[PDB]
Symmetry: D2
C-alpha cells in the first residue's frame, strides 16, 4: 500500500513517525504523500483534522488511522506504544473499513464555495450583531439573533456541539445537528432553543437579515466571507473511511473520553 | 373502510365525532372499533396517545388521524372546521401513509413485560434514591444517580425530551434519545450529562444498583414495577402509520408549535 | 461546653464518635444531647442535615461541626484523622462562628405548617399533573407546568439546585434561589426558564390551579400535604452557625468538591 | 434642575426629545449636557447604555430615566405617550431615587485601565484559543478553556447572562455573576459549568495561560487589549441611580419582558 504519516511536529510525534516509516520499510509499503491509500495521523484530534483536510479530495480512496501521543483523541484508536503492532497489522491488510458521515457547507455570494467538515461548521458575525433567517427545506423556520450557530456531524457531536448542549449521536446515523450559541429570547425575539437533528437530504439555509459579512469556521479553519447571500448545510454524500483493527465501539470511546479511562 | 373515532369527551369533541359519523354514513364507511383500518382521534395529544394505545396490537393495519379541538396538538393535522373536508377525503381514499418510529421497553423481573411508546418511556425510583447502571450494547457506560431517565422516540423529542434539554429529531430518523433528569455530578459521581441518540439495533439496559422498585411511565401511563432485574430500551420494529392528506412538514409543525402560528 | 455527637452509624463513624467522647472526657466538656451548645456530625452531608433538623429549635444556641468519614461532604470541615486536633481546639474554645442563611417554607391549608431548610425545599405533585401559579410579592409572575420547583438556600446551591442548572451562590448573600424541574414551554405554556434569585423579605407564593395535593420535601424529608391553599417561601430570619477553626473558604470548598482535590 | 435628553436618533425619538424640551421650557428646567442632574434616554436599552457611559464620571450626581420608543426596554419605565406626564412629574420633583449595583473591571498590562459596566463585561480571545486561569480571592479555582466568560451585574442578569444560562437576580442584591460561554469539559479539561454569584468585596481575577491578547467588551463596547497580565472583576462601589415615579417592580418588569405584556 501507498501510505503517508503526518505528525503534530513535537519531538515525540516526529520520532514515532520516523520509527513507523522504518518499520514500514520492512514490508510492501511505499511512502507516498501525493496518492496515499492509508493516511496515519500522529498527534491529537487537531492533527487528525488537518490530515483529513490535506486529503479531502481523495476521501473515497483513503483509510485514515489516528495515533494520540498526548491524552486520548477522539479520532485516535492507538497509543504510541502500539505503533509496531499497527505497522504489522496494516501491512498484512488485516483490517475492516468503517465510514462516518460528513457535513457539506455551501456559501453563495454575488458565486459559490463548498467545504467539507469532519467535526462542524459554525457561523458568526464579522463584528456587528449576528442575525440570520433559518430556512429548512425552503420553509422559514426562525429568525436567529445571538452569537452564532454550529452545525455538527455525528462524530463532531462530542466536540463543540457537546459544549453547546447538543446531543451525542452515534456515527452510523446519517444526520447533522444544529446548535445555538447564546440566542436572545424575550417577548420580541424567539428561537427554538433546542438542538435540531436533520436527516440526509434536508437542507438548512441561513439567510442574512442586515449585515452580509460572516466568519465561517469549518473544523476550526475560520474564514471571513463578504457579501454572503446564503449559507447552505446538508449531509455530504462523501464519507471519511477509517481503518479498524479491533472493536473500539463509539460508546466506549465516549465513555473513555468523558466518564473515566 | 372500517373506521372508529375516539373523543376527548367534552361537549365539543363528542359533537364533532357525532357529526363526522353522520358524514361517514353517506359513504362506504363502516363504524367498527374492534378492527378499524382508520382511527380518528378528536381531542388533544393525550387523546391521540390513548387512541394509539387502544390499538397498539394492530398498528400495521391502522392509519391514525388527529383532530385538535383545543390549541394545536403535535399529533394533530386538522382543526375542527376542516372535519367535513377530512370525511370526504378519507372516504375517497385520497391519502398517503407516513410512518414514525416507536420505542420498545422491556422490563424483566425474577419474567418479562414489553411496552410500546409513541412519545417516551421514563424511569424513576419508587421513593428512595434512583441509582442505575447504564449498559449500552453490553458495555457498562455510566452509573446514573439523579431523579430519573427519559427515552424518547423521534416524534416524542418535542415533548418531555424537549423539556429535559434533548435535541429535536426529524421522525424519518430511526432512533431513540436518552435524556437525564437532574443527575448528581461531583468528584465522586459522574454522568455524561448530554442527551444520547441511539440508532436502530442498539440496546440500552438499565440495571439496579440497590433498590429494585421503579416507577416506569410509557406515554404517561405510570406503573410501579417491583423486583426489577433490567429495563431494556430499543427502537421497535413496529411503526405507527399516519393518514396524510396534504403536506404539513415536521419542521413546520415544530415552527407552528414553538415559534409562532 | 455541653456538646453532642451524631453518627451515620456505620462501624467507622460509631468508633470515631466513641473515641472523641473519650477525648472530650479529658476536658471541661459535658455530653448533653438535650441542650448542647456544640453539635458534631460524623458521617456525610445527609448525617449533617439530620443533625441540623434534630436541633432546629435551638439554632441560635448551637454551633455545628461536620466530620466526613467518606469522601468530602460539603458541610464537613474535618477528615477523621483530624478528630483529635478538633477535640483539643473545641475544648480550648479556639474558634470563630460563621453563619449561613436558611429558607423558611410555610404551607397553608383550610391552618399552617412551617419548615426550615438548610439545603432546599421542593414541591411536586402527588401523582397528577403539577400546575401552580407563581406569585412574587403578591404579583402574579407565571403559571408553572412541569415536574416541580426547587427553592434553595445559598449553601444549598451546590446540591439539588446545581443539578437543575442553578447558579452557585456564596453563603454570605442573604437570598434564596428558585429553579425549575422540566417545565413545559410551547406557544400555549410559558415559564421564565432561568433560575431566579430573591433577596431577604421577598415572598414567593405557589398557588394551586387544579389539584391541591403536593409532595413537599425539605432537605429530602418528603411529606404529602393535602388541601393546600398556598406554599410560601422566604429567607428565614434564623441562621445556622458553624464552628470554624481555620480558613476553608466557600470557593475552595466548591473547587475541592467539583473540580479536583 | 439641569437635565439633558439623548435620543436614539430616528425621527420618532428626535421629535419626542424636541417636544419634551419644549415642555421643560415651561418650568424651572435648564437644558445642560455638561453637568445634568437628570439624564433622559429616549430609545432602547442600547440608547440607555450609551447615556450611562456618556455620564459615567458623574453617576453620584445624576438620576437616569428611560423612555422606550420601540418595544419594552428593560431600563425603560415610560412609553412615549406618557412623556408629558413625565415632564410634569420630573419638574415638580415628584420622585424617589432607586440604585442598582455596577461592575468594575480592571485590566492590567506591563499599567491599568478600569471600566464600569451596567450590564456586563465579557472576555474572549483575540482569535486564537481562549484559556485563562480563574482566581477567586487569590485562590486558583479553575482553568477555563472555551469561547469566553461573562461577568454580569444584577440588572444585567436579564441580558447576555440570561442567554448563557445564568440566574436572574434582583437588583437590591449587591453581587456579580460569572457565566461560561461553551467551555470544554472532558477527562482532561474541567470547569465548574454552573454560573457563579459573588458578593461585594470578592475579587475574581483572570490570568492568561498562553495568549495574552483579549477582546474585552463592557456593555457591548468591545476593545482589543494586548499584553494583558490580569483582568479583575469586583462589584463597584459606584451605583447608578434611577428616578422612579411609580412602582414598577423588578419582577413585574421581568414578567412583562419575558412572559407576557
Ligand atoms: N468552545 C469550544 N468547546 C468545545 N470544543 C470546541 C470549542 N471551540 C472549538 N472546538 C472544537 O475544536 C476543534 C479543533 N481543534 C482540535 C480538536 C478537536 C476535537 N474533536 C473531537 C470530537 N469529534 N469528539 C470529542 N472530542 C473532540 N476534540 C477535543 O477537543 C480538544 C481540543 N479543542 C479545542 O481546544 N477547541 C477550542 C479552540 C481551539 N481549537 C483548535 O485549535 C483546533 C481536545 O481534547 C480534542 O481531543 C473544533 O473542530 C471544535 O469542535
Ligand atoms: N415535565 C414535562 N415537560 C414536558 N412534557 C411532559 C412532562 N411530563 C410529561 N410530559 C409529556 O406529556 C405527555 C402525556 N400527556 C398528553 C400529551 C402530550 C404531547 N406530546 C407531544 C409531542 N410528541 N410533541 C410536542 N408536544 C407534545 N405534547 C404536548 O404536551 C402538552 C401536554 N402534556 C403535559 O402537560 N405533561 C405533564 C404531565 C401531564 N400529562 C398528561 O396527563 C398526558 C400539550 O401541549 C401537548 O400538546 C407525555 O408523554 C410526556 O411527553
Ligand atoms: N436529583 C438530585 N441531584 C442532586 N442533588 C439532589 C438530588 N435529589 C436530592 N438531592 C440532594 O440530596 C440532599 C439529601 N441527601 C444527603 C445530601 C446532600 C448534599 N448537600 C450538599 C451541598 N449543600 N453542597 C454540595 N453537595 C451537597 N450534597 C451531596 O449530595 C450527595 C448526596 N445526595 C443525593 O444522593 N441525592 C439524591 C437522592 C438521595 N438523597 C438523600 O437520601 C439525602 C453527596 O455527595 C452529598 O455530599 C437533598 O437536600 C438535595 O439537595
Ligand atoms: N448573544 C447575546 N444574547 C443576549 N444578549 C446579548 C448577547 N450579546 C450581547 N447582548 C446584550 O446586548 C447589550 C448591548 N446592546 C443593547 C442592549 C440591551 C439589553 N439590556 C437588557 C437588560 N439589562 N435586561 C433585559 N434585556 C436587556 N436588553 C435587550 O437586548 C436586546 C438588544 N441586544 C442585542 O441584540 N445583543 C446582541 C448583539 C447586539 N447588541 C448591541 O448592539 C448593543 C433588546 O431587546 C434589549 O432590550 C449587551 O450589554 C449584552 O447584554
Amino acid at each position: 500500500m501507498k501510505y503517508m504519516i503526518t505528525s503534530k511536529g513535537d519531538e515525540k510525534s516526529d520520532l514515532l513517525r520516523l520509527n513507523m516509516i522504518a518499520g514500514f520499510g520492512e514490508y510492501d509499503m511505499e511512502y507516498d504523500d501525493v496518492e496515499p491509500e492509508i493516511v496515519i495521523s500522529i498527534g491529537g484530534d487537531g492533527t487528525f483534522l488537518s490530515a483529513f483536510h490535506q486529503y479531502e479530495e481523495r476521501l473515497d480512496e483513503i483509510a485514515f488511522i489516528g495515533i494520540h501521543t498526548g491524552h486520548l483523541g477522539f479520532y485516535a484508536d492507538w497509543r504510541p506504544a502500539e505503533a509496531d503492532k499497527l505497522v504489522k497489522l496494516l501491512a498484512k491488510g488485516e483490517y475492516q473499513k468503517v465510514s462516518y458521515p460528513l457535513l457539506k457547507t455551501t456559501v453563495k455570494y454575488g458565486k459559490e464555495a463548498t467545504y467539507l467538515a469532519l467535526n462542524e461548521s459554525t457561523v458568526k458575525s464579522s463584528g456587528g450583531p449576528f442575525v440570520v433567517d433559518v430556512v429548512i427545506n425552503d420553509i422559514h423556520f426562525e429568525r436567529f439573533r445571538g452569537d452564532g450557530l454550529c452545525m455538527s456531524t455525528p462524530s463532531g457531536t462530542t466536540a463543540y456541539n457537546k459544549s453547546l448542549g447538543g446531543a451525542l449521536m452515534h456515527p452510523s446515523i446519517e444526520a447533522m445537528q444544529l446548535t445555538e450559541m447564546a440566542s436572545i429570547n424575550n417577548r420580541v425575539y424567539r428561537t427554538i432553543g433546542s438542538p435540531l437533528v436533520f436527516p440526509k437530504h434536508h437542507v438548512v439555509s441561513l439567510q442574512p437579515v442586515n449585515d452580509k459579512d460572516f466568519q465561517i469556521s469549518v473544523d476550526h479553519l475560520s474564514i471571513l466571507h463578504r457579501d454572503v447571500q446564503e449559507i447552505r448545510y446538508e449531509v455530504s454524500a462523501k464519507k471519511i473511511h477509517f481503518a479498524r483493527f479491533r472493536s473500539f465501539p463509539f460508546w466506549r470511546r465516549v465513555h473513555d473520553s468523558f466518564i473515566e479511562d
